[PDB]
Scaffold this motif. Structure first.
Motif, PDB file in Angstrom:
ATOM      1  N   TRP A  93     -15.324  -9.388  14.245  1.00 41.20           N
ATOM      2  CA  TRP A  93     -15.625  -9.555  15.592  1.00 41.20           C
ATOM      3  C   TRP A  93     -14.986 -10.964  16.071  1.00 41.20           C
ATOM      4  CZ3 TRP A  93     -18.429  -6.264  12.641  1.00 41.20           C
ATOM      5  CH2 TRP A  93     -18.707  -5.065  12.905  1.00 41.20           C
ATOM      6  N   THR A  94     -14.405 -11.393  15.117  1.00 40.45           N
ATOM      7  CA  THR A  94     -14.010 -12.904  15.439  1.00 40.45           C
ATOM      8  C   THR A  94     -12.386 -13.008  15.870  1.00 40.45           C
ATOM      9  OG1 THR A  94     -13.456 -13.201  13.403  1.00 40.45           O
ATOM     10  CG2 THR A  94     -15.717 -14.028  13.897  1.00 40.45           C
ATOM     11  N   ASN A 122     -23.459  -2.087   9.939  1.00 38.91           N
ATOM     12  CA  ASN A 122     -22.503  -3.344  10.065  1.00 38.91           C
ATOM     13  C   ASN A 122     -22.434  -4.154   8.691  1.00 38.91           C
ATOM     14  OD1 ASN A 122     -21.188  -5.631  10.940  1.00 38.91           O
ATOM     15  ND2 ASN A 122     -22.591  -6.392  12.337  1.00 38.91           N
TER      16      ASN A 122
HETATM   17  C1  LIG Z   1     -21.872  -7.312  12.800  1.00 35.68           C
HETATM   18  O1  LIG Z   1     -22.493  -8.509  11.968  1.00 35.68           O
HETATM   19  C2  LIG Z   1     -21.611  -9.793  12.371  1.00 35.68           C
HETATM   20  C3  LIG Z   1     -22.139 -10.802  11.630  1.00 35.68           C
HETATM   21  O2  LIG Z   1     -23.631 -11.199  12.032  1.00 35.68           O
HETATM   22  C4  LIG Z   1     -21.904 -10.187  13.811  1.00 35.68           C
HETATM   23  O3  LIG Z   1     -20.991 -11.346  14.172  1.00 35.68           O
HETATM   24  C5  LIG Z   1     -21.931 -12.488  14.944  1.00 35.68           C
HETATM   25  O4  LIG Z   1     -22.085 -11.949  16.238  1.00 35.68           O
HETATM   26  C6  LIG Z   1     -22.816 -12.951  16.904  1.00 35.68           C
HETATM   27  C7  LIG Z   1     -23.025 -12.177  18.167  1.00 35.68           C
HETATM   28  O5  LIG Z   1     -22.173 -11.868  18.718  1.00 35.68           O
HETATM   29  C8  LIG Z   1     -21.854 -14.090  17.209  1.00 35.68           C
HETATM   30  O6  LIG Z   1     -22.340 -15.104  17.931  1.00 35.68           O
HETATM   31  C9  LIG Z   1     -23.308 -16.106  17.561  1.00 35.68           C
HETATM   32  O7  LIG Z   1     -24.056 -16.321  18.934  1.00 35.68           O
HETATM   33  C10 LIG Z   1     -25.156 -17.282  18.629  1.00 35.68           C
HETATM   34  C11 LIG Z   1     -25.935 -17.305  20.031  1.00 35.68           C
HETATM   35  O8  LIG Z   1     -25.130 -17.443  21.023  1.00 35.68           O
HETATM   36  C12 LIG Z   1     -24.558 -18.596  18.242  1.00 35.68           C
HETATM   37  O9  LIG Z   1     -25.451 -19.532  18.086  1.00 35.68           O
HETATM   38  C13 LIG Z   1     -23.709 -18.509  17.223  1.00 35.68           C
HETATM   39  O10 LIG Z   1     -22.773 -19.800  16.763  1.00 35.68           O
HETATM   40  C14 LIG Z   1     -22.410 -17.403  17.217  1.00 35.68           C
HETATM   41  O11 LIG Z   1     -21.515 -17.785  18.210  1.00 35.68           O
HETATM   42  C15 LIG Z   1     -21.893 -14.662  15.828  1.00 35.68           C
HETATM   43  O12 LIG Z   1     -20.856 -15.766  15.570  1.00 35.68           O
HETATM   44  C16 LIG Z   1     -21.042 -13.664  14.731  1.00 35.68           C
HETATM   45  N1  LIG Z   1     -20.860 -13.961  13.327  1.00 35.68           N
HETATM   46  C17 LIG Z   1     -19.746 -13.516  12.672  1.00 35.68           C
HETATM   47  C18 LIG Z   1     -19.796 -14.147  11.360  1.00 35.68           C
HETATM   48  O13 LIG Z   1     -19.055 -12.932  13.213  1.00 35.68           O
HETATM   49  C19 LIG Z   1     -21.332  -9.082  14.524  1.00 35.68           C
HETATM   50  O14 LIG Z   1     -21.464  -9.344  16.058  1.00 35.68           O
HETATM   51  C20 LIG Z   1     -21.794  -7.814  14.314  1.00 35.68           C
HETATM   52  N2  LIG Z   1     -21.306  -6.682  14.913  1.00 35.68           N
HETATM   53  C21 LIG Z   1     -21.992  -5.794  15.403  1.00 35.68           C
HETATM   54  C22 LIG Z   1     -21.366  -4.484  16.212  1.00 35.68           C
HETATM   55  O15 LIG Z   1     -23.251  -5.848  15.683  1.00 35.68           O
END
Ligand SMILES: *[C@@H]1O[C@H](CO)[C@@H](O[C@@H]2O[C@H](CO)[C@@H](O[C@@H]3O[C@H](CO)[C@@H](O)[C@H](O)[C@@H]3O)[C@H](O)[C@H]2NC(C)=O)[C@H](O)[C@H]1NC(C)=O
Ligand SMILES: *[C@@H]1O[C@H](CO)[C@@H](O[C@@H]2O[C@H](CO)[C@@H](O[C@@H]3O[C@H](CO)[C@@H](O)[C@H](O)[C@@H]3O)[C@H](O)[C@H]2NC(C)=O)[C@H](O)[C@H]1NC(C)=O
Ligand SMILES: *[C@@H]1O[C@H](CO)[C@@H](O[C@H]2O[C@H](CO)[C@@H](O[C@H]3O[C@H](CO)[C@@H](O)[C@H](O)[C@@H]3O)[C@H](O)[C@H]2NC(C)=O)[C@H](O)[C@H]1NC(C)=O
Ligand SMILES: *[C@@H]1O[C@H](CO[C@@H]2O[C@@H](C)[C@@H](O)[C@@H](O)[C@@H]2O)[C@@H](O[C@@H]2O[C@H](CO)[C@@H](O)[C@H](O)[C@H]2NC(C)=O)[C@H](O)[C@H]1NC(C)=O
Ligand SMILES: *[C@@H]1O[C@H](CO[C@@H]2O[C@@H](C)[C@@H](O)[C@@H](O)[C@@H]2O)[C@@H](O[C@@H]2O[C@H](CO)[C@@H](O)[C@H](O)[C@H]2NC(C)=O)[C@H](O)[C@H]1NC(C)=O
Ligand SMILES: *[C@H]1O[C@H](CO[C@@H]2O[C@@H](C)[C@@H](O)[C@@H](O)[C@@H]2O)[C@@H](O[C@@H]2O[C@H](CO)[C@@H](O)[C@H](O)[C@H]2NC(C)=O)[C@H](O)[C@H]1NC(C)=O
Ligand SMILES: *[C@@H]1O[C@H](CO)[C@@H](O[C@@H]2O[C@H](CO)[C@@H](O)[C@H](O)[C@H]2NC(C)=O)[C@H](O)[C@H]1NC(C)=O
Ligand SMILES: *[C@@H]1O[C@H](CO)[C@@H](O[C@@H]2O[C@H](CO)[C@@H](O)[C@H](O)[C@H]2NC(C)=O)[C@H](O)[C@H]1NC(C)=O
Ligand SMILES: *[C@@H]1O[C@H](CO)[C@@H](O[C@@H]2O[C@H](CO)[C@@H](O)[C@H](O)[C@H]2NC(C)=O)[C@H](O)[C@H]1NC(C)=O
Ligand SMILES: *[C@H]1O[C@H](CO)[C@@H](O[C@@H]2O[C@H](CO)[C@@H](O)[C@H](O)[C@H]2NC(C)=O)[C@H](O)[C@H]1NC(C)=O
Ligand SMILES: *[C@H]1O[C@H](CO)[C@@H](O[C@H]2O[C@H](CO)[C@@H](O)[C@H](O)[C@H]2NC(C)=O)[C@H](O)[C@H]1NC(C)=O
Ligand SMILES: *[C@@H]1O[C@H](CO)[C@@H](O)[C@H](O)[C@H]1NC(C)=O
Ligand SMILES: *[C@@H]1O[C@H](CO)[C@@H](O)[C@H](O)[C@H]1NC(C)=O
Ligand SMILES: *[C@@H]1O[C@H](CO)[C@@H](O)[C@H](O)[C@H]1NC(C)=O
Lengths: 726, 728
Positions: free
Chosen positions: B149-150, B243
């Motif tokens: 999702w990055t 996920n």
């Molecule tokens: C499936 O799992 C991955 C891994 O956990 C999820 O990716 C992560 O999603 C979060 C939220 O969209 C990303 O944002 C984070 O937000 C917090 C709070 O604002 C912030 O402190 C962090 O630095 C980050 O920006 C996070 O970066 C991201 N991590 C990775 C490795 O991708 C993904 O969203 C999940 N997919 C679904 C459909 O749930």
């Protein structure tokens, strides 16, 4: 028998024309800029005094590239850290020298990176633009009053023009106009929010690792244009605890109905300003005359007091509607307009009367109104000897239109047939400037009796230098194309012999209202070509040409790339049959619009030309700016003129280039005629398998005028021309 | 009678070399596309059958640019709406055709503008990249599972490489690797957030009113490089968690200490993956071998299985660290590395022992490992006749390294000295492809006895046509300098006469590890120049050239723009000494690195060359990409090698160009060697007032390979060469 005028002479500027650039500071004196200082001259006697020796700043710490004395004579604006932008625009740092105390002002100085500065018309007030906003200083050393707060790079311009207004409308970066005595400051505001950006790479010095991308709001034919608003602020009322109040002058309704442009602003009196607007379809304009109202504080533009200027055969004005010259009371005015027959003459108006009266007439035209007194209207025209390429100063008696006197025709007919003029503040004196066919001649005169006071510069020195060189001559004549006569000039090789056959080079431009056949003396590349290479360099003014009436000029209306290209071929055709012209060795070249016509002629299949050079050519009108293109072509829509827009490209003629030798040249940083235009020409030639010669000049713009590049391109073109001719 | 090989013959591709491109779908069969009908052959007997009829897809509404059958052969991926990007990358539309029910799948289709698609190595799973994110499809008709999702344009790349990783690190676009049986999906993630962008205009078709500005994250020498991360996800858990977590494999610490790259990834077994990492200062490299820990579900890499490969005289590998070839059980592997004598040979490694055992000879090099069975290891080398420019297939007995056999050397010694090979899935069969010095010849063999089964293509058609034309000849030989031999080749005009003096054109490239002198047969521009214009076209492999040992290849370490350049000048002098070259008509030309060398030579003041042509040249190393440039030049900093970066530019030699005729050519949309490079050369020449010839090619990239552009540049160069030599 002496040496010739060589390429190096031209490129190194060996033989330089002397000038006499003066600036009138009153009805009696003028300043004369020199190398080491500035002097003030008394027009009556000719005596002078030193105003300042420049050495006054030997230790200023900066190289000054320009000075500007307040009309007051009390302050000097010193410009430095100059950085050119477009043709007129640039930025720079500024310091002010107080002449009263002979000391540099150290407090509240003008910000660095200022875009424009200008003294008021009479005292020592200043109005400048920094970061797109307007600022006003009442005293040189006092804090500035911020007039506008909306300025934003590439989006909102206050007091300065955007790219297209700078280049095709005002031919200036300034977008502010002080009232006669400095009371009011009028200014325009441009909004380029939705104007597309032209983008191109700039490589810079070798040291720059990554190229930078230059982006500038630029409207190409049919695209979204910048919108404009007009305001007027009272500089005697600005507070310091309160923001300045700017009054807007809007409409006319006949303009607001669609896209339009502000095309002219001229103050009539201390409280009356005139504005001319033009519809995007440039065959209809309106002049508003607005008066200040103390009680309401607004600027009222009475209907019935406006004047409509339209054309059924083309656009309005030569390049835009003319500037009006108001009488002393501002209740009437004179202005050049196309008469019933299509020739431009002076028409006399009353601000509230619908029809004007033409005070001049005939099958010739007025070039411009230069001065107006209660007594006379001074103007320049090409009436003399019916030569459209010659120009003389005349005066018409405002009490009796039957009394017209030519003031320059007879001064020196052999040497002088092309003049420009500069009158003192109230037209008590005037400087005449002859520029051909002989060496430039500057003279001073007094209006009361038109006495020739003295010679200011006669280029006697240069004349003595050229007598030692085999210089070419210039033949100005004409040919007749079914009924009408069209003029041409030929730069002839030294000791020209009609018995011999010479190779000929057609030097072309041919854009709307252009004139390439005139009586002006020039020291250019053509001089070298005829003097050293014995090549005849001709130029021809056919359909589309200016200063000969609308029948000729408007002939290519909505039809660029047609009559002007055909007439160019027809002329070349008649030249080949002359006898002293070798028909097997005829070439053609041009720059900008000239590159376009050169390219169009070469792809016509005439078979008349052997080789040709196109420099920074337009290749298809949809790539060029709106203001210029639409003026002649209309809009590129199927309802309007899209069909011809598509039929007049250079790339559509690619296949025809197999019969000639072509040299394509363009600067990569051309902000005017985008490098894109030539990139599309080369791609079309490649797609059709046409071999040709090419040369790009990195980081050069439309002028390809950097010292080394200037030398390189002419050197490259010379090899090409002689290779073709040998 | 009998005409010569004309420019038009070359430009119109009148004389075509027939090929035989096949694709092994098993250990016994291969597919062969005949432009209309794709049939399948049986290696054993040669009998075929139609696998997919010509019309099968007519009325598809689209032109099929390519097909791709899944491993189990149940589905076929139809590739259309192709849109090329860089050297390997391109975007396209995709459709999957069910062969089990002769149905075109219309449910949950792969998105348009999909960046890359790959079948699992077994079965019919699918992994693709769209908008820089990885998606996985377990079943062709079922909905995909998003893995990342990055994804972010010009910023974060998942499953695909950024510009420099594609061109210089991997020489491939894809950045994902399915495990052998398809359970795991490994992939890399590139973060170009801080990487500078190269920007240039793209004009497009005449119809475009405003040119577009292309911007690509591209690290130039010394600039900020993309960062990389590696992950492994278990695709069999996708239909159970919502996920699936991507497990990261980081380090080594020796690598994390500073800037580095991920240079290779290959699966050893179903649960063992090997990763090779390289420091930005490419003289040090580390390989990790990581096993899946069924307990903690993590991937651990034992330090005892970590293998270091460094270099004291140059960089690692020819262009990058060598790929490992694991034995069936994954406990040992073979890899090409330079031995103590600077020669690249194959050595045997055990995953937990640091000392490897070399299994091949000396004064020559192994080019690549082609196949590994329980019995033998097959490889290609230039050992035969000590000819560094020849290529042959050999096989060594794993139980006795003294037993080495050459399988291609003797098949047809006069006509074949340059071979490549393609083995069937289990190395039961193999197709040999001979490319010189005679006409291409394709043969099929069975590995049991290496018996030649049959001739697939011998270009008999072509052979006939050419006996009707005055074709040039080719000489391959060497010259000895400072007691070291250097090879060269010359394309000689028909009826070559050593008594006559011929004009000569030096065809140069000369980049690190390059080879311009070989046995390959070519029908190119040089063929025309020799045959029709009677010009000798020569090439020389000097210091820095490859396949001859590090003594020669590393000779230009940290010194590009020197020996390599001087040697091309000497070659011309040496050829002149041979007595059949006109000293007054010696020219030189090159493309890319060859443009740089051509330019440096023309500005050297030698006065050996009369004229020259530089196509898409590099002008100053600080403008070229970091991975390629720094490999040989180190960092452009005062503490490192900046002085030589600044001393080796073409611009600093502009003055010297007054004494030669120079033609400079470059595509405006060159994403590799930026137009900027030639823009700075022309400006340098203008600055000193030196006249020259130029040609830009609107919207052409580094290849200037569009049909029209290709014909145009060669036509233009020909006019220049002929004019310079006073021909015809
Ligand atoms: C499936 O799992 C991955 C891994 O956990 C999820 O990716 C992560 O999603 C979060 C939220 O969209 C990303 O944002 C984070 O937000 C917090 C709070 O604002 C912030 O402190 C962090 O630095 C980050 O920006 C996070 O970066 C991201 N991590 C990775 C490795 O991708 C993904 O969203 C999940 N997919 C679904 C459909 O749930
Ligand atoms: C790709 O690499 C870039 C580094 O260039 C990563 O961007 C960095 O992400 C962190 C998130 O932890 C940013 O820090 C945050 O900064 C904000 C300030 O606006 C602050 O409020 C937060 O508390 C946190 O400190 C950091 O600024 C940012 N750096 C840059 C140059 O953008 C990015 O996360 C990487 N992406 C991936 C997928 O690895
Ligand atoms: C300069 O000219 C602008 C229009 O060319 C002025 O703006 C106006 O037009 C925009 C559309 O470009 C309107 O909408 C904007 O905002 C909405 C909602 O956020 C967006 O959906 C839309 O795409 C635009 O971004 C603006 O509402 C409108 N402005 C106003 C004040 O109503 C702009 O105001 C003008 N600037 C000046 C100083 O005159
Ligand atoms: C130029 O000189 C005049 C004075 O010229 C003299 O007087 C004339 C009447 C005439 O006879 C000339 O031939 C003489 O050479 C200067 O006029 C003076 O101006 C100052 C202020 O500017 C004023 O105070 C004096 O009264 C003026 N003198 C006269 C006699 O009127 C004039 O200033 C000089 N201009 C320059 C630029 O030096
Ligand atoms: C290619 O043909 C073979 C048939 O082989 C035959 O028998 C050999 C011994 C030899 O004499 C050949 O010349 C003969 O053509 C096909 O083999 C069949 O394969 C299927 C499985 O797919 C198997 O069930 C059959 O028993 C095989 N036939 C025989 C006689 O054993 C093979 O399928 C053909 N391949 C193609 C692509 O056409
Ligand atoms: C405009 O800038 C000059 C030069 O200052 C430098 O260049 C500027 C573009 C910006 O980058 C500044 O930060 C740089 O310091 C100002 O001139 C002064 O110059 C002296 C020595 O040259 C320096 O010590 C001062 O800091 C500079 N500025 C000031 C306010 O003292 C100049 O003043 C600037 N214009 C204005 C109106 O302040
Ligand atoms: C004059 O008008 C300007 C523009 O509206 C005012 O300046 C802004 O004031 C707001 C509110 O304090 C700030 O948030 C902005 O940063 C200011 N600048 C701009 C460009 O908007 C200013 O306050 C007004 N001054 C007076 C005396 O009314
Ligand atoms: C400059 O012009 C302005 C505008 O006409 C003059 O200001 C007016 O002066 C009269 C005095 O006779 C006042 O009654 C008006 O109210 C003023 N108008 C405004 C808008 O202020 C001004 O006098 C002129 N300057 C000079 C030096 O004559
Ligand atoms: C100014 O130009 C416009 C546009 O060219 C003229 O109006 C068009 O005239 C043509 C016929 O000449 C019609 O077919 C169009 O329907 C008219 N309208 C438009 C929007 O195109 C207009 O006549 C010109 N004005 C003058 C005074 O000649
Ligand atoms: C191939 O993939 C895995 C390789 O790890 C094979 O082994 C199974 O792996 C999973 C972990 O992902 C374990 O939980 C199972 O216990 C392993 N199998 C056994 C028998 O232990 C898997 O069997 C293979 N899958 C296919 C489709 O061939
Ligand atoms: C690989 O080459 C690099 C060159 O950058 C070497 O780096 C360092 O070590 C050299 C030898 O001790 C020094 O001479 C260099 O100055 C130093 N480089 C820097 C930037 O400080 C490195 O040692 C080499 N590796 C091997 C195994 O030889
Ligand atoms: C009249 O002259 C013009 C240009 O001079 C030419 O195009 C045209 O063919 C001639 N005849 C007519 C009937 O227009
Ligand atoms: C791809 O694009 C085409 C054309 O816009 C559209 O018809 C088709 O449905 C698209 N396919 C997918 C899978 O989005
Ligand atoms: C000897 O040095 C190299 C071989 O090491 C050779 O290429 C070169 O021509 C000779 N001389 C010089 C000065 O390089």
């Amino acid at each position: 028998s002496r040496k010739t005028y060589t390429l190096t002479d031209y490129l190194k500027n060996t033989y330089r024309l002397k000038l006499y650039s003066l600036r009138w500071i009153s009805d009696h004196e003028y300043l004369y800029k020199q190398e080491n200082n500035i002097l003030v001259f008394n027009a009556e006697y000719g005596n002078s005094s030193v105003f300042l020796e420049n050495s006054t700043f030997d230790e200023f710490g900066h190289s000054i590239n320009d000075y500007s004395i307040s009309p007051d004579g009390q302050f000097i604006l010193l410009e430095y850290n100059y950085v050119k932008q477009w043709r007129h625009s640039y930025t720079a740092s500024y310091d002010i020298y107080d002449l009263n105390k002979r000391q540099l002002i150290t407090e509240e100085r003008i910000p660095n990176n200022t875009q424009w500065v200008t003294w008021s018309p009479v005292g020592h007030k200043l109005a400048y633009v920094w970061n797109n906003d307007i600022y006003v200083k009442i005293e040189p050393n006092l804090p500035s009053y911020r007039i506008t707060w909306t300025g934003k790079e590439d989006i909102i311009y206050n007091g300065i023009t955007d790219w297209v207004y700078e280049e095709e409308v005002f031919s200036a970066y300034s977008a502010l106009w002080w009232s006669p005595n400095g009371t009011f400051l009028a200014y325009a505001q441009f909004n380029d929010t939705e104007v597309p950006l032209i983008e191109y790479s700039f490589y810079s010095d070798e040291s720059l690792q990554y190229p930078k991308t230059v982006r500038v709001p630029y409207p190409k034919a049919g695209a979204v244009n910048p919108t404009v608003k007009f305001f007027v602020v009272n500089t005697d009322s600005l507070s310091s605890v309160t923001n300045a109040t700017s009054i807007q002058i809007t409409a006319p309704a006949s303009m607001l109905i669609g896209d339009h442009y502000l095309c002219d602003v001229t103050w009539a009196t201390q409280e009356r300003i005139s504005l001319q607007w033009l519809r995007r379809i440039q065959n209809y304009s309106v002049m508003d005359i607005c008066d200040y109202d103390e009680s309401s504080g607004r600027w009222n533009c009475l209907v019935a007091r406006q004047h409509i200027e339209m054309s059924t055969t083309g656009w309005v004005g030569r390049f835009r509607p003319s500037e009006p010259h108001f009488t002393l009371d501002g209740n009437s005015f004179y202005k050049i307009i196309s008469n019933e027959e299509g020739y431009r003459h002076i028409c006399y108006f009353q601000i509230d009367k619908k029809d004007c009266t033409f005070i001049t007439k005939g099958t010739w035209e007025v070039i411009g109104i230069e001065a107006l007194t209660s007594d006379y209207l001074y103007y320049i025209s090409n009436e003399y000897k019916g030569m459209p390429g010659g120009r003389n100063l005349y005066k018409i008696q405002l009490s009796d239109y039957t009394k017209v006197t030519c003031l320059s025709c007879e001064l020196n007919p052999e040497r002088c047939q092309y003049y420009s003029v500069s009158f003192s503040k109230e037209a008590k004196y005037y400087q005449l400037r002859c520029s051909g066919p002989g060496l430039p001649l500057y003279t001073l005169h007094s209006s009361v009796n038109d006495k020739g006071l003295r010679v200011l510069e006669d280029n006697s020195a240069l004349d003595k230098m050229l007598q030692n060189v085999q210089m070419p001559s210039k033949k100005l004549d004409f040919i007749i194309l079914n009924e009408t006569k069209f003029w041409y000039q030929m730069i002839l090789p030294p000791h020209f012999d009609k018995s011999k056959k010479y190779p000929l080079l057609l030097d072309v431009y041919a854009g709307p209202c252009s004139q390439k056949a005139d009586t002006v003396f020039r020291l250019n590349w053509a001089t070298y070509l005829a003097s050293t290479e014995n090549i005849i360099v001709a130029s021809f003014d056919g359909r589309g040409s200016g200063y000969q009436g609308d029948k000729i000029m408007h002939a290519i209306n909505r039809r660029l790339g047609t009559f002007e290209v055909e007439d160019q071929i027809e002329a070349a055709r008649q030249f080949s049959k002359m006898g002293f012209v070798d028909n097997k060795r005829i070439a053609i070249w041009g720059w900008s619009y000239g590159g376009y016509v050169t390219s169009m002629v070469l792809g016509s299949g005439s078979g008349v030309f052997k080789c040709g050079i196109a420099v920074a050519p337009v290749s298809r009108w949809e790539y060029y700016d709106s203001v210029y293109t639409e003026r002649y072509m209309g809009l590129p829509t199927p309802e309007d003129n899209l069909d011809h827009y598509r039929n007049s490209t250079v790339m559509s003629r690619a296949e025809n280039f197999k019969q000639v030798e072509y040299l394509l040249i363009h600067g990569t940083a051309d902000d005017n005629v985008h490098f894109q235009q030539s990139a599309q020409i080369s791609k079309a030639l490649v797609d059709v398998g046409v071999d040709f010669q090419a040369m790009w000049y990195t980081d050069e713009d439309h002028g390809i005028a950097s010292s080394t590049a200037h030398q390189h391109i002419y050197t490259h073109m010379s090899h090409f021309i002689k290779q073709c001719f040998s």
